């Protein structure tokens, strides 16, 4: 017996990625996470937890 996910994980591009995806020709995994670090907490050191 083992336990794990039953369905695949989801990754669809929302409106914040889609502006970059059409115009700049690039997209990025979890754009909302990059916004939490560069513009919101710029001096937060990269920890583990």
């Amino acid at each position: 017996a083992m336990s794990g996910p039953a369905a695949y994980a989801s990754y669809v591009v929302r409106g914040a990625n889609l502006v970059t995806a059409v115009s700049y020709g690039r997209a990025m995994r979890n754009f909302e996470q990059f916004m939490a670090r560069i513009v919101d907490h710029p001096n937060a050191l990269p920890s583990v937890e």
């Binding site: 995806a21 059409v22 690039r26 997209a27 990025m28």
Partner: protein, 99 residues
């Protein structure tokens, strides 16, 4: 880096004034650079395509204190403030031996 042209389907805006006069002459003799013709069977928005960053993965160096190694059971640790001042240390033993 020279800024180039690209055919990516921008959300274009419309201007009140027109543009179309004397353009057909200006393709033959260059009035302006960075132009690319499009005929009506292929004048559309292209299918959008891209590449992607999937993550920035970085090592974190967990420091290991000497005092919390189990090596330090083989030693006796004393914090000594001014050690550049000392010249020499010295320990004296006295051993009596009965018969």
């Amino acid at each position: 880096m020279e800024a180039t042209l690209e055919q990516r389907p921008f959300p274009y805006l419309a201007t009140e004034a027109n543009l179309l006069t004397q353009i057909k002459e200006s393709a033959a003799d260059g009035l302006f650079k960075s132009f690319q013709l499009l005929l009506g069977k292929d004048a559309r928005e292209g299918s959008v395509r891209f590449e992607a960053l999937l993550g920035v993965y970085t090592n974190v160096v967990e420091f290991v204190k000497f005092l919390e190694t189990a090596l330090a059971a083989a030693c006796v640790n004393t914090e000594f403030k001014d050690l550049r001042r000392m010249i020499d240390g010295k320990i004296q033993f006295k051993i009596s031996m009965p018969t």
